[PDB]
Amino acid sequence: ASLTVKAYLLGKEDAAREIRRFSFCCSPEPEAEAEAAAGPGPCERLLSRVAALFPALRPGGFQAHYRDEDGDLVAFSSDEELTMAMSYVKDDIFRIYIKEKKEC
Amino acid sequence: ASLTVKAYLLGKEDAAREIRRFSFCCSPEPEAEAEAAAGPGPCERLLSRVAALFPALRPGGFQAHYRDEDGDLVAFSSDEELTMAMSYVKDDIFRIYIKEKKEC
Amino acid sequence: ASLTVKAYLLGKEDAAREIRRFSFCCSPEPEAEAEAAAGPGPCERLLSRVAALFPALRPGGFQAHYRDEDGDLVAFSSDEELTMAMSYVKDDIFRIYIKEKKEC
Amino acid sequence: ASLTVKAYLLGKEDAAREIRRFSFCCSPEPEAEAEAAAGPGPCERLLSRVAALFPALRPGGFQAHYRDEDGDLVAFSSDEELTMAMSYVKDDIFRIYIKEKKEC
Amino acid sequence: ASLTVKAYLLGKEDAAREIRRFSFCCSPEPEAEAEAAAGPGPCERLLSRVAALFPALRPGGFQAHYRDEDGDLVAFSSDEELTMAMSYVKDDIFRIYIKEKKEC
Amino acid sequence: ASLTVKAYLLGKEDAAREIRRFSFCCSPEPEAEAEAAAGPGPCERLLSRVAALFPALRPGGFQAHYRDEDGDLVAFSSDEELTMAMSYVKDDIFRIYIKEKKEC
Amino acid sequence: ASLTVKAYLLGKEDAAREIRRFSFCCSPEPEAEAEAAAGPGPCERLLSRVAALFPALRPGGFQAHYRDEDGDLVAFSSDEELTMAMSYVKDDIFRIYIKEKKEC
Amino acid sequence: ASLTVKAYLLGKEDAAREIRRFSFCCSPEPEAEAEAAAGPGPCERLLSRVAALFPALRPGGFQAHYRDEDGDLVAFSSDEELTMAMSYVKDDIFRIYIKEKKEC
Amino acid sequence: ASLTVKAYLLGKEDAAREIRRFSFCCSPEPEAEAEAAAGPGPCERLLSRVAALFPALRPGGFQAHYRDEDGDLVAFSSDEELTMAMSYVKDDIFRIYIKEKKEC
Amino acid sequence: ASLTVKAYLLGKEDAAREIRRFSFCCSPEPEAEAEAAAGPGPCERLLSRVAALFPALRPGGFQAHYRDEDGDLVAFSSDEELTMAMSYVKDDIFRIYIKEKKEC
């Protein structure tokens, strides 16, 4: 399941500041034997890869979102919630919206 | 009864700060024998799951609401009152509105 | 459980004089056999590490605090009370507030 | 009945000098058979635990209070009076106010 | 694989200020023996050549982009992402869009 | 790992008095054999080089800082803490903030 | 390497008081045999020539600066730091900013 | 599945001439045994009920529509197409748009 | 590959007369054994389904189109040309434009 | 060299009557050994494929054109002239204009 993720980085008034467009492999998985318990999570691997590409942000300091049917930026941080996020993929493009974690 | 809960987290002037959109299983229930008295309550399981998802709040320190026909944010904390809250579900989306418990 | 501790050292009017930001390993533990009774405590290892980093203070002469929901600097010195202190961690940052032990 | 007690230690002009925030188990009770007459009292177990945590005070030399509806620091020392003290719990936080027993 | 790169330098309101049009040799590579580990990267050689031509910018202080199918300026800085950038070449012209790295 | 350090020297109201901008080689290391135990530390080599450049300060009499995500000047003096300082590098610029050690 | 240096002399509120615009020969060097150890330094020859032109200042009593990408007046006094200063030359104009050394 | 149908009857320039607002029971179904093959269809029962309410139209002489995401009046006459029509229900209101079948 | 086809039926001045919006299963295929040579074609199954839904047209007497990047109604009748038609799908909606085959 | 050909079929007043948009493989060629002299020509394979797609025309009875820089429909029938036709490809779209061969 080759899945393209188009990571929007949002700015001041929720206008996009930098777009990245990488590829992601959620349903694919490594070798079918346990070298660990079971890897990282599918949302933990996503946020580890969004943090690796953008130079403007550091890992652990950003909140990834998506747009639902109402147009609202629904956040996601879990991997049982990333599966609800990915039911909104249009063609193969999973558009996420990155916002940084400021003061309050 | 698969039931989607869209948890709005309200901010300063009751504008939404973070939206979460999980799923909830009120009328479904576990195995039909008593390993306890009867579990937690259906409102106790809801507020335990809203607190588990949001990183911005800690359990016991938030008040969950809903909108009635007048547009008012009616609070709910009981499980005989959660049944009156859930008579306002529109399609299958049970929109709650989270507010934190500050000074006074 | 990698846990970041941001140690504020408070000054005259409870304004921060020096901030340190180390990492702490409370729930992790050494080898699963007894070379002693059971190590030091998880609060004894914390206050031994806060005293090791700051040159401005000496061990046994400082009181570590935290902020609760009311904004008050609740002190902690026990390890059954450090577990109540650590239920206020926000992302992974456990902010403590150090005050020195003066005359009276 | 898990019950959180936030022990304020009052100072010179009834300003708080040290806050402790422990947990207390009034309505819970041990094994349902008599190894004694009936334990200590529920107020005797409270004041034995407030004295155990604070290093700044010694047992038998402090007066625990609470705030009533008038804002007054009503003292309590009995266990038929601790039950009237605990009808002022707000969420699960039972705020007591400790004052030491000086000269006159 | 002779590949023409038309480097647009963007200005204030994303209007082009200076255009350069050089040639680039991504899939071609030097002698088939290791004088190093493996050269620079194919994106590192691109950004080293864009910085060499423009006198108006200095290396390390510019962000190269491209236009995707939506018309958005998708940035690229990696060499596993330059391969996704170069799937949008039209005839042999790989149009990149240079933006400088200002304050915030 | 070529790493640029931009040393701000702070003044009266934490306004910068002199900026220096040198280069630093933390992860690079000398010849792979022991002429000593293991050199100086990576934080000891940093503070020895900040003291060598500025004529306005003398070695052993300055405290180097950095800004975390909260905007606070977190100090660092150790080399297990310099590794946490250097997880805030933005492009390749590691901005430190120098303050001198006065009376009290 | 003919290199033009435009020496701004800054005044009260960092406004330019006198501009000089001379030429400088950093990478060029004299006869390829040692009449000395190796001349003066390339920063020592620069500050000896800035002091020779301006009548308003005397040698040893001025601090030469440059502007980095942030707009800050980064000072330089070394000749391993003048090489980092000269990576900001725009066409062939190396703009330095002179400030005199007053009381404190 | 109680489902409200708001039947707009369109006029000359696609302006609504009469609105009816009845209720419909698509996913509900009668007794679970075959008194026939399987009833009428779920679209045949809908158009039989729209024709029963409006006095201004006669059955077999009207075309029921719906609005898609583009704002276009997409017609439907089948019951495998009514299931695509009913994926646009907003709260529980299924707005259809009735147009009569004139000359050409 | 669930693929939605929105069939516009064009009228006199290429204005839409009736819209249908069905679903189509191009890349999906039946059981992996040959009961025939290989079914109908993927364009033959499309035009057999567009003719089945619209009552206003009869099979063999309509020309299906699509819009390319120039805005022109490019026709398609082959199944090696339907694969070029379907590279213009936007989200999952494959908009075709039906025109009937009149005199000349 | 994948090359898209957009075949316009011109009508009465040189307005397009049917557009086809196929793909063409001019510079690609079959197996590198002679089963014939050398295939058909690259213009003979083009006009054999334009005649295969359009049902409205028969092979040998149409004249293929292209637009030059003056906007004129320059015809081509040779394969040393098709190479001059294909120097006007814009992105990868080689727009030809088909006209039928009538009386005079």
UniProtKB/Swiss-Prot annotation, chains A, B, C, D, E, F, G, H, I, J:
There is a cross-link at residue 90 (Glycyl lysine isopeptide (Lys-Gly) (interchain with G-Cter in ubiquitin)). It comes from the Eukaryota. The modification Phosphoserine is found at residue 23. Residues 42-104 are annotated as: Interaction with PRKCZ and dimerization. Changing residue 81 to A: No effect on interaction with PRKCI. Residues 49-79 are annotated as: Interaction with PAWR. Changing residue 12 to A: No effect on interaction with PRKCI. It is found in: Cytoplasmic vesicle, Autophagosome; Preautophagosomal structure; Cytoplasm, Cytosol; Nucleus, PML body. Induction: By proteasomal inhibitor PSI and prostaglandin J2 (PGJ2) (at protein level). By phorbol 12-myristate 13-acetate (PMA). Expression is directly activated by NFE2L2/NRF2; creating a positive feedback loop. Ubiquitously expressed. Changing residue 8 to F: No effect on interaction with LCK. Residues 1-49 are annotated as: Interaction with LCK. Ubiquitination by UBE2D2 and UBE2D3 increases its ability to bind polyubiquitin chains by destabilizing the UBA dimer interface. Deubiquitination by USP15 releases target vesicles for fast transport into the cell periphery. Residues 2-101 form the PB1 domain. The modification N-acetylalanine is found at residue 1. Molecular adapter required for selective macroautophagy (aggrephagy) by acting as a bridge between polyubiquitinated proteins and autophagosomes. Promotes the recruitment of ubiquitinated cargo proteins to autophagosomes via multiple domains that bridge proteins and organelles in different steps. SQSTM1 first mediates the assembly and removal of ubiquitinated proteins by undergoing liquid-liquid phase separation upon binding to ubiquitinated proteins via its UBA domain, leading to the formation of insoluble cytoplasmic inclusions, known as p62 bodies. It is linked to Paget disease of bone 3: A disorder of bone remodeling characterized by increased bone turnover affecting one or more sites throughout the skeleton, primarily the axial skeleton. Osteoclastic overactivity followed by compensatory osteoblastic activity leads to a structurally disorganized mosaic of bone (woven bone), which is mechanically weaker, larger, less compact, more vascular, and more susceptible to fracture than normal adult lamellar bone. In a cell model for Huntington disease (HD), appears to form a shell surrounding aggregates of mutant HTT that may protect cells from apoptosis, possibly by recruiting autophagosomal components to the polyubiquitinated protein aggregates. This is Sequestosome-1. It comes from Homo sapiens. The gene is SQSTM1. The chain holds residues 2 to 105 of 440 of the full protein.
